[PDB]
């Protein structure tokens, strides 16, 4: 019985949930329901100018915005537009779907204060986005420590464990939405043409890497399992542990208290009233028996790949900064990430560039958590409106790479062809450094790759034509593609940059030791 297991559960908590202080409970509410930004205000507090340029910006231009940011600036543009004509406002949408141009100087440095004043006070959403690294100079001070007092007190209020007697006669549940774990896969999960089914081979790719999860928020899951709404293809079956401690919600809930791990037991398509869900069956295990399991993998995967680049056996190259619920697959997929980089770029040049940003304590970074939360980003850009989230990025000051596994990349197939995008910024930056080491610059600074960039900049992706570096860096993700018939276009269309490309290449590997 469905009632009877609530109400069994509910009498567990009685006590504890009678025993909450009306702070205790407004706390809760905060977790479940984040206090939005008031657009009102926002708008308000633009000036004319800055009103004008709202009204007009591509905001999915943008190429460091979060999704979340992204969502929340498209509202607040709707808001700003709802006074034109509708003319003016079916021009502006009929201009942003024919055309992907990139963002003017004036309009991106608009959006990246703007950013400082758009966060919502969510949680759940700070603890996921930065793995509980809650101390990270990804916002505001003030905002940090009234997190941190928030978190701390949820925590005291989660005191009280399921307990023996319950803990192996419950499952527990939770309705996800793909994207929240693989953004890439999430696209095509879902069968192209009948969207009653699941592709496959997709579920093959989601399910053979998927071991174990980590959760470093507050679940929140319902006792009953809940029919899915239309976003959500997953459906998690959990068993806690005795000493796991929750808290009971009201409509028949129980919040988890953070740092949990999961095993997976068994993923599984089922069906459900004609249509096709993937069951997840997950136990909670100590939060420290999977870190164990992810440092054992950090340390593997150097050895194997400081063997193959000749580096010394102690050296720390990649990094696995792992808190979310997909890490297995974050962690297993480093290692054919960086297959394909080995298969597809000139051995060469992969070990003459890898042994410069070794030189510099450079790192692979692979990781569930926002890029600004990373401190390879952080630590070298203090400003939150220089902080970029995205699919990669690579940091000179620290000769790092860093890769987002959860989201999916601008016209990318795959998380191989954003490392190599990536890597084409480090070949960039040490080009650059042996034409003068000491005024280390960018060799897509030089006055010959700007001429250039200025004749075929528009001539590859959308995204290329960014900037010199955007346009260096798809230039070298396209000629190292396992399809020939990407390595052809850019000889074709972009012979100059071909040639340019290929002679950077041969300089950096012709360069002595
Ligand atoms: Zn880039």
Known sequence: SRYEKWEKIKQHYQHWSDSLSEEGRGLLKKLQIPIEPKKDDIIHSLSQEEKELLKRIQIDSSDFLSTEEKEFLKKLQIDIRDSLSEEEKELLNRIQVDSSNPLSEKEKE?????????????????????????????????????????????????????????????????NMNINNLTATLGADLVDSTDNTKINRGIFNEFKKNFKYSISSNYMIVDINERPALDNERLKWRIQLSPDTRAGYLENGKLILQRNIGLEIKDVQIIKQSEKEYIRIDAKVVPKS??????????????????????????????????????????????????????????????????????????????????????????????????????????????????????????????????????????????????????????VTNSKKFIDIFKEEGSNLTSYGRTNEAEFFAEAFRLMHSTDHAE???????????????????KFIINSLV
């Open 487 to 505: 390595r052809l276009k850019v000889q074709k269309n972009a012979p100059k940059t071909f040639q340019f490309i290929n002679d950077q290449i």
């Open 289 to 442: 028996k999977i870190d164990t399991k992810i440092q054992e993998a950090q340390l593997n995967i150097n050895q194997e790949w400081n063997k193959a680049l000749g580096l010394p056996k102690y050296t720390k190259l990649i990094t696995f900064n792992v808190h979310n619920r997909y890490a297995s697959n974050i962690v297993e997929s480093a290692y054919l990430i960086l297959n394909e980089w080995k298969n597809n770029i000139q051995s060469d040049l992969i070990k003459k560039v890898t042994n410069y940003l070794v030189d510099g304590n450079g790192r692979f970074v692979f990781t569930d958590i926002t890029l600004p939360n990373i401190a390879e980003q952080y630590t070298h850009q203090d400003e939150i409106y220089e902080q970029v989230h995205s699919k990669g990025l690579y940091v000179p000051e620290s000769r790092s790479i860093l890769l987002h596994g959860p989201s999916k990349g601008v016209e990318l197939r795959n998380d191989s062809e954003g490392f190599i995008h990536e890597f084409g910024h480090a070949v960039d930056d040490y080009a650059g450094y042996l034409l003068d080491k000491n005024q280390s610059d960018l």
């Open 110 to 174: 608009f959006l990246k204060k703007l950013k400082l004043d758009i966060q919502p006070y969510d949680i759940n959403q700070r603890l996921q986005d930065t793995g509980g690294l809650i101390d990270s100079p990804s916002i505001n001070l003030d905002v940090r420590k009234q997190y941190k007092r928030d978190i701390q007190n949820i925590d005291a209020l989660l005191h009280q464990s399921i307990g023996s007697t319950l803990y192996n006669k419950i499952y527990l549940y939770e």
